[PDB]
Amino acid sequence: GRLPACVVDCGTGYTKLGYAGNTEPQFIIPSCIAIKESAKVGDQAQRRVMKGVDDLDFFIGDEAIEKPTYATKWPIRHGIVEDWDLMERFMEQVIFKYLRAEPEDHYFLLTEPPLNTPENREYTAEIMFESFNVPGLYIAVQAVLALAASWTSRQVGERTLTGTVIDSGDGVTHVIPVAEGYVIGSCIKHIPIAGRDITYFIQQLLRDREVGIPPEQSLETAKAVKERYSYVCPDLVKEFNKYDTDGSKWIKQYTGINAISKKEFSIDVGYERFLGPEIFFHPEFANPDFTQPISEVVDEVIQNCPIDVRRPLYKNIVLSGGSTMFRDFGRRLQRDLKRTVDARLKLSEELSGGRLKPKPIDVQVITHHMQRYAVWFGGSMLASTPEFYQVCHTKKDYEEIGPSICRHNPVFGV
């Protein structure tokens, strides 16, 4: 008989492991690896050669953050794997320790961001096909699986196959318009500004103002401040004024534990309540290359799709990923989008001569019960169908053509 396919959604800040056919990932670990690192001289490809069996003395996931004598490395940066040695070791413990899957009896469904270079896919195919020897692989785009995770929380008869998926993870934020089940790939947008940029901005804010934060935790604090006291503001300068004139109400206190002497430190959370998420509607706060808000990027995405599929795309904007769990994020997004759309419609009516008043475009932003792991569940659907075993790259295909079998994805033509 057949065994369920393994689903491994490898994200920059968190990896979701499971067996296809379930409702939620069996494991959600941090995407980090603790290896023994010491003071050495020479290149990186030369000091990584470990004598004996010392290359198996490493940990991953939750067990890699606890280890205080190991060095913690993150192999994935901005969704693109920058280190393949650490990624191979991470994958081998993901398969042989957590999933406990024999990699020769299970099809694998990995994930990727839209702008993953083809050489990354070729290296992933080389790893899964020659090292782990999987009978089949399928590298699906991350946000396109997040659409089929909003159907579990919406009433019957309004579970559509058309919508704009906004996936904001730890390292990348991408916008994918799906229409009737077909990924409109030539309209996908991809911005490397995401949760971790918010965490760097927040720690730089805290470090310029607060005192008493242990250095070795200056990041771990900026996550607990970001994922707890952060919201979205309707206006920036008005919020600065609201904090200045009535600071006794808007300024909160965060009390953490210094995990060396177990003492407690206390800091004041002020402007970084609303300046964190604001790098979504002002990306220049974290990366001066991008200057375009997320509402305008979504509007460009939808306005580039075919005409008669623009009106349903506005109706089912599905959020996904952790970085979209900010209070009143969807509300401000929908407000800006409604402003843009109504202004465009009124301009078109005025240019027409003033005879017809067209239907106001319904704009809706869908928050659902599965956002934190909306991608994985989507995979758990796709990798549970029969047709799945018809779209995978069989081992024969790799043995015949080579890793170049995995070189194409729906973002580029030919």
Ligand X SMILES: Nc1ncnc2c1ncn2[C@@H]1O[C@H](COP(=O)(O)OP(=O)(O)O)[C@@H](O)[C@H]1O
Summarize as ranges the residues that interact with Mg ion (CB under 5 A).
11, 169
With CB under 8 A as the contact rule, which of the stretches 297-305, 326-334, 346-354, 406-414 interacts with other proteins?
326-334
Count of residues in contact with other proteins, rule CB under 8 A: 120
Cα 63 to chain centroid distance, Å, stands at 22
Query: What's the min distance (Å) between Cβ of 164 and other proteins?
Result: 16
Query: What's the min distance (Å) between Cβ of 369 and other proteins?
Result: 4
Measured at the alpha carbon of residue 108, what is the angle toward residues 398 and 153, in degrees to the nearest 5? Answer: 140
| Nearest to 146, CA basis, from 380, 346, 349, 354 | 380
Residues 242-271 that bind other proteins (CB under 8 A): 243-244, 247, 249-250, 252, 270-271
Strand positions, DSSP E, 280-390 = 317-320, 365-366
Residue type, 75: P
In the complex, the residues that contact ligand X under the rule CB under 6 A are 11-14, 169-171, 195-196, 199, 223, 226-227, 321-323, 325-326
With CB under 8 A as the contact rule, which of the stretches 110-118, 225-233, 343-351, 352-360 interacts with other proteins?
225-233
Residue type, 306: P
In the bound state with other proteins, the residue whose beta carbon lies nearer, of 114 and 393, is 393
In the bound state with other proteins, the residue whose beta carbon lies nearer, of 62 and 357, is 62
What is Dmax (Cα atoms) for the chain?
82
Cα 108 to chain centroid distance, Å, stands at 20
Residues 61-100 that bind other proteins (CB under 8 A): 71-72, 74, 85, 88-89, 92-93, 96-98, 100
In the bound state with Mg ion, the residue whose beta carbon lies nearer, of 170 and 239, is 170
Strand positions, DSSP E, 142-293 = 163-168, 173-179, 182-183, 189-191, 252-257, 264-269
Question: For residue 31, what are the CA distances in angstroms to 109, 237, 286, 320, 405?
Answer: 17, 37, 22, 19, 27
Query: What's the min distance (Å) between Cβ of 377 and ligand X?
Result: 13
In the bound state with ligand X, the residue whose beta carbon lies nearer, of 256 and 321, is 321
Binding mask 365-384 for other proteins (x = CB under 8 A): --xxxxxxx------xx--x
Q: What distance in Å separates the CA atoms of residue 376 and residue 311, rounded to the nearest whole number?
A: 28
Query: What's the min distance (Å) between Cβ of 106 and other proteins?
Result: 7
Q: Contact at 8 Å (CB) between 389 and 135?
A: no
Residue 307 interacts with other proteins (CB under 8 A): yes or no: no
Query: What's the min distance (Å) between Cβ of 186 and other proteins?
Result: 23
Beta bridge partners of 16: 9, 28
In the bound state with ligand X, the residue whose beta carbon lies nearer, of 54 and 328, is 328
Query: What's the min distance (Å) between Cβ of 320 and other proteins?
Result: 12
Question: For residue 211, what are the CA distances in angstroms to 28, 74, 205, 398?
Answer: 33, 28, 11, 56
The interface partner of residue 275, options being other proteins, Mg ion, ligand X, none and the CB cut-off 5 to 8 Å by kind, is: other proteins
Beta bridge partners of 105: none
Question: For residue 9, what are the CA distances in angstroms to 117, 267, 268?
Answer: 17, 35, 36
Residue 103 interacts with other proteins (CB under 8 A): yes or no: yes
In the bound state with other proteins, the residue whose beta carbon lies nearer, of 41 and 414, is 41
Residue 209 interacts with other proteins (CB under 8 A): yes or no: yes
Q: What distance in Å separates the CA atoms of residue 357 and residue 95, rounded to the nearest whole number?
A: 59
Which listed residue (80, 83, 185, 200) binds other proteins by CB under 8 A? 200
Residue 21 interacts with other proteins (CB under 8 A): yes or no: yes
With CB under 8 A as the contact rule, which of the stretches 166-174, 241-249, 346-354, 356-364 interacts with other proteins?
241-249
